[PDB]
Symmetry: C3
Subunit: 450 residues, 3 copies
C-alpha cells in the first residue's frame, strides 16, 4: 500500500532567539526538518507535504533541492487545520503519516512498525510511556484499542496515573483524513482545530484506533530552545557512537566523538578522543586517528595514521601515508601511498606522489609533486603580484632545499636538486643542480651588546 507524509514545519521558535525559523537549526550538521524529510524518504514516501510558514523565504533558500510539496500556512489555526491544507493532495488510497519538523529523531524502524499496526479504515497512534506524564494527553484503552485522549486538565484521579501518553504522530488512509478533518471543530480554550479529535471522530464512526509504543522517548521529543536541542544532539551522537562501536570501530571515548554526516569504515579503525567527522568520510582498514583531528569529506586509505590536531577537508590520502601532527589539508589535496606530511604544513589543491615527504613549516599550493621527492623545511610555493594562482610542477626524485621559494608558473624536472635558500623563477631541467651563490660580510671580534 502506497505511502505519503505530512511534516509540520511552520513554527517561529521564538525561544531559540534566532533569525532562523525553528526547524532549520541543526542536529549533527543537518537541519532538524531534513532529518524528518530523509526519514520520510527512507520509509518510501511518494509525496512529502511540507507545511511551512514562519521564515518562509529562508526555508525555501535552505531546502531548495528537497523533493517536497510546499504548502504555505498563513495563520495558526491548529494541527488539524495545518494537515487539511495538504489533504486535497492525499490519495484516497495510500497511507498518510503525520510528523513534526521540530521532533527530528523519529526512526524509520518505529514508523514502519506504526504503519504495520494500522487497521484498515482506522488510525495507528504512536504513544510513549513517561514516569511523570504531567502535561501530556493520556491514552485511554478499551480494551487494547484507543477510545480517547484525555488532556491533563480533564483527567480524573485514576486517569492522571495513566503513564501512556499521546505523541502526536499518527497514520491513517487519505480518504479517512479528508473525511474526519472536515468534521473537526474548535470549541476549546485555545480555539484551534486539534488533530487529537480524530481519535474521537474515528470511534464515533465505529473505526478502530490502535496504539503503538515508541522505543525511546527521545525519538518523540521536540526542541523548543537550544538547551533542548543540545540534549537531542548528545543523545543522537551517543547512539551513532554506540553503533560504530558494536560494528568494531574503537572509539576511545564515545562521549568525546562527533559524527556530522556519514562514515564508512574498514576493520581495526582506532579513533582517539575529540575527533570530529563531517560530511562523507571513508576510512580503510587499520586507520588510526589521533586526538583533536577534524576530517570533512575525505577518503583515507588502509593503514594510514593521522597524528594529533590535523584538519583535513575535501582530500584523498593513499595507503600507508602518515599525516600530522598539526597538518592541514585543504580542498584538492591528493596524497599518494606512503607519503609523509608533518607539522605546520599546509597543502592546498595539490597532488603529491608516492613516497614523497613534506615534513615542516611548508606551504604547497596549486602544485603537482612527483614520487620520492624531498620537500625541505620552510619551502613555499608562491605567485607574482597580479597573478591568478598558477601552477608549480615538480617531477620525480627531486630534492628541494630548505627555505626555498618556488615562484609559479614553474617546472622542475626529474632528478633535479635545489639547494637551500634558493628563489626559483625559471624552469629547472632534468638532473640539474641549482645552488644559490651568497655574498656575506664577516667582521671579526664583534662584541655583542650584552
Amino acid at each position: 500500500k502506497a505511502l505519503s507524509a505530512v511534516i509540520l514545519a511552520a513554527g517561529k521558535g521564538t525561544r531559540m532567539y534566532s533569525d532562523l525559523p525553528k526547524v532549520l537549526h541543526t542536529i549533527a550538521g543537518k537541519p532538524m526538518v531534513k532529518h524528518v524529510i530523509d526519514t520520510a524518504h527512507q520509509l518510501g514516501s511518494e509525496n512529502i507535504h511540507l507545511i511551512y510558514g514562519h521564515g518562509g523565504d529562508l526555508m525555501r533558500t535552505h531546502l531548495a533541492n528537497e523533493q517536497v510539496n510546499w504548502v504555505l500556512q498563513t495563520e495558526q489555526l491548529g494541527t488539524a487545520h495545518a494537515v487539511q491544507q495538504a489533504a486535497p493532495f492525499f490519495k484516497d488510497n495510500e497511507n498518510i503519516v503525520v510528523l513534526y519538523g521540530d521532533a527530528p529523531l523519529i526512526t524509520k524502524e518505529t514508523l514502519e512498525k506504526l504503519i504495520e499496526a494500522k487497521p484498515e479504515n482506522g488510525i495507528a497512534l504512536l504513544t510513549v510511556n513517561l514516569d511523570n506524564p504531567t502535561g501530556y494527553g493520556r491514552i485511554i484503552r478499551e480494551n487494547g484499542n484507543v477510545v480517547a485522549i484525555v488532556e491533563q486538565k480533564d483527567a480524573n484521579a485514576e486517569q492522571l496515573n495513566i503513564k501512556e501518553v499521546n505523541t502526536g504522530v499518527m497514520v491513517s488512509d487519505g480518504a479517512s483524513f479528508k473525511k474526519w478533518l472536515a468534521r473537526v471543530g474548535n470549541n476549546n480554550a485555545q480555539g484551534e482545530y486539534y488533530l487529537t479529535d480524530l481519535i474521537a471522530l474515528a470511534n464515533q464512526d465505529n473505526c478502530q484506533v490502535v496504539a503503538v509504543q515508541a522505543t525511546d522517548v527521545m525519538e518523540v521529543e521536540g526542541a523548543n530552545n537550544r538547551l533542548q536541542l543540545a540534549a537531542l544532539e548528545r543523545y543522537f551522537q551517543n547512539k551513532q557512537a554506540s553503533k560504530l562501536l558494536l560494528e568494531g570501530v574503537m572509539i576511545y571515548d564515545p562521549a568525546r566523538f562527533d559524527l556530522r554526516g556519514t562514515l564508512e569504515h574498514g576493520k581495526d579503525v582506532e579513533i582517539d578522543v575529540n575527533v570530529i567527522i563531517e560530511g562523507n568520510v571513508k576510512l580503510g582498514d587499520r586507520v588510526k586517528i589521533g586526538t583533536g583531528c577534524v576530517l570533512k569529506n575525505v577518503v583515507i586509505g588502509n593503514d594510514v595514521e593521522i597524528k594529533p590536531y590535523s584538519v583535513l577537508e575535501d582530500s584523498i590520502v593513499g595507503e600507508k601515508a602518515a599525516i600530522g601532527p598539526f597538518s592541514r589539508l585543504r580542498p584538492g589535496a591528493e596524497l599518494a601511498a606512503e607519503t609523509h606530511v608533518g607539522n605546520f604544513v599546509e597543502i592546498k589543491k595539490s597532488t603529491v606522489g608516492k613516497g614523497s615527504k613534506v615534513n615542516h613549516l611548508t606551504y604547497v599550493g596549486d602544485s603537482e609533486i612527483g614520487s620520492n621527492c624531498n620537500i625541505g623545511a620552510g619551502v613555499i610555493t608562491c605567485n607574482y603580484d597580479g597573478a591568478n594562482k598558477f601552477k608549480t610542477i615538480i617531477g620525480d626524485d627531486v630534492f628541494v632545499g630548505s627555505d626555498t621559494q618556488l615562484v609559479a608558473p614553474v617546472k622542475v624536472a626529474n632528478g633535479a636538486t635545489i639547494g637551500a635558500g634558493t628563489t626559483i623563477t625559471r624552469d629547472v631541467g632534468e638532473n640539474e643542480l641549482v645552488i644559490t651563490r651568497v655574498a656575506q660580510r664577516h667582521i671579526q671580534g664583534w662584541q655583542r651588546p650584552i
Copy 2:
C-alpha cells in the same frame, strides 16, 4: 534595612595538599572566596568582614584590592568565636549574613530570600533537604519555626529520619549577634564555641527562628579536597552553559564548554566543542567559533568566523574577519573589518587594516599594516641584535612577497611591491618595486646520490 556580611575564610585546607590556603583555590578561574565576596557585594553589603588565618600573607597578596575588613583569627575556637571577632564592627541595626569562603556557589537569589524571611529580632536559617542526611544536624520545627538543631549523635530514631538539615548560613541583626555570641559556651566533645547554639539562645530568649530552604544542595556544598572542588566546577560550568543556551547561544556540547569570566553575546552565536572563554569576552551577532579555540579578553565583531585551534588574547577583531585554523593572536593584536589571518600565523601587538590578508607561516610583531595589503607566506618582522622591539610600518595596498624579512625600524609606503625572498632594511617609497637579484650556479647532469 542595611546589610553587612561575615565570611569565614581561616581554614588550612590540609586535604588539598597545597601551599595555598583553602579558599584561594579557583572555580572558573576565580578564587572560591572571591565568589562569596562578589555575591556579598551583589546583595548590597556595606561591610564585608573577612575572617582569615592560615596562609595570611598569601590571602593579603591575592586579595589585596578587595573591599573587605581584615579580621585575623589566631586560634581555632569555633564558628561562634570567629564571628565574634567581627562583632564589634556590627551596627546594632543592620542585618548580618554569615557565609563560608569554602562554599562558593551560594547565590544572591537564595540569600535575598533568606534575608526577607528574617523576623524582627530573630534569626533566618538556611536549610537543605538531603536524601541521606547522615552526619548533618537536623532541623526540628514547632510549628514551622526552628526550635533546635539536633546533631547526628544526639538524635532519636524518628529525628534521624528528618531529611532537612542545617547549612551553617544564617541572618540576624547586629544587636542580636553581639548579645547571643557573648552567651555561647563550649561544653561539648570538641571544646569549641558553636554558632549553632544561637538557635537555642534565640528560643531561650523567646525570639523567632525561621527556616528557608536552598534551591540546590550544590550551592551550600564546600570543597575540602580537589575532587570536591572539581565537582563544584562541573556543576557551575553546566549552569553557566544552560543559561547561555536559554539565551540563544548555540553551544554544541555544554559538557565541553568552559567560561572562566564574563561573556557578552549577540544572537545566532555558534560555539563548537572544547572552547574556553576567559576574562571578559564580547561576541557580536553570528560569530562562529570552531573546535578547540581559546578566547581570553577579546572583542569579536559581527559575522566573524574563528576556525579550529585558534588562541586569542587581549585582542580586537572587526566585523566579517576570518581567523584560523591554527592562528595565534597575542596581546595588542587589532584586526580591522574583513581581514584574514590563516594557519601558523602569529600576530603580536599590531594593527592590521581593512581587507588585508596574512594567511600562512608568518610572524607580525610591533607593526602597523594598512588596508588591502597582501602579506605573503613566510614573512617575518624582526629586529637588530641589541634593539628594543622597534616598529614596522606598512601602508595601504602593499604587496609583500613570500619569505621576506622586514627589519625594524622600517617603513613601507602605500602601493609598494616587495618581491619574494627579500631582506628589507631601508624605507620603501610610494609605488616602489623592490626585487632581490639572485646569483645562482647551475650544474647540468648532476646525478643525485640515489
Copy 3:
C-alpha cells in the same frame, strides 16, 4: 603460603570484529591481559600460567617479554578443562588464583582479601551483588558458607531473588585443584567441563567454600565488544583521575583527562581540560599544563608552564621553562632551565642550554645549542642531499637572525652574531659577525595591477 595464578586468555572475541584476539585490545594503552598479568605479579604470584589459543602467534609476538608459562588450548571444552591444562604445574602446596584475561580491572586489594578468606583445603569464591541478577549463577549459602551455584534456568521463584552472583574468580590450593578437576564431568546442555562444579565437588568432599564480595561490579566485568571495552575505559580513567585529585593534583575536568601509563607528580600541579599523559611521565612542583597537551615519556621540572596544544615525547624539560602554545618536542629534545619554546616550533634530538629562546616558526634538529642564545623566527637546521643527519653545534650567547638556514655539519662558536636571511655553511668563529650582502633592484613609480 606461596601463590601462583592461572589466566584464561584463549577466546577469539568474534564480536570485536578484529584481527586481534580478544585480550590484546587495550585499556589505558595496555592490553587487557597485561592488566591481569601485572595484577597477578603485584599479588606475588610465583608462576603465571597463561591459557592461550586463538590469535596464538599474535599473543606470542605482543606478550613476548612477559614472565608467563605458555599453555596452549587447542579446543574449547570449558573452563575446568582449560585450568586442568595448567594443573600439572601446580604445587600441591601453594594457592592458585583463577582469573580472566578479558576482565582486566580486578584489583590486587580485592584479590588479597579473597586469598585471606580461603579456608585450609577449601575454596574462596569471589561474588558480587547485582540489582538485576538475571542470567548469572546465584550463590546459595548455608549458613555463611557456599553450598551451590544455581544457574538462571534451574532456580526456583525465591532463588531468582538472590542478588548475590558468581564471578568465576576462585582461589584454592594446588593439591585440591588437581583432585577436583579430574572429577569434573560435562553432562549439561553445552557439553563442557565447568569450573563451577568445584563448588559441588568441594561440599561433596566435606570441604568449606567461603564467599568474598567484590568492591565494585566493574572490577569483574568483561568486555565482549568495543562498546563494553569503552565503558571499562571510562570507569578506569575516572578512578585514576579521582586518585590523582585526592593526592592534590588539580585536574580541572576529570571526565576530560586520560592517563595511559604512570604519572609521578609534585604538589600544586594544574592540568587543564583534554590532556593526555602517556608512558612514564614525571612532573615537578607547580607545573601547569594547558588545554590539549599530549605528554608521552617526559620529565618536566619544577615551575614549568606548558601552554595549549603542545605535543611532547621522549623529552626532558628543566625548571622554569616555558613551552607553547603549538610547540612540538620530538624524541631526544633536552631543554635546560629557563628556556623558551614558542608557537610553530619543532625541536628534534637536540639540547638547548639555559635561558635560550626559540620562539617562532623554527625547526631545530640534531643540534646542540648553548646558554642564552636567541634563535630567531624562521630559522631552520638542515642537511645536504645524500647526508646522514649531521650535527649543528651552536655555542653560548649566540644571536641567530630570522630566517637563517644552518647547514649541517657546522659549528657556530661563542658570542657570534648571524644576521637575518643568511645561509650558513662554514664554521663561524668566536665573536664573529656574519651579515648577508643583498643585491636589490628598485623600480620607482611601479603601479600595482589593482
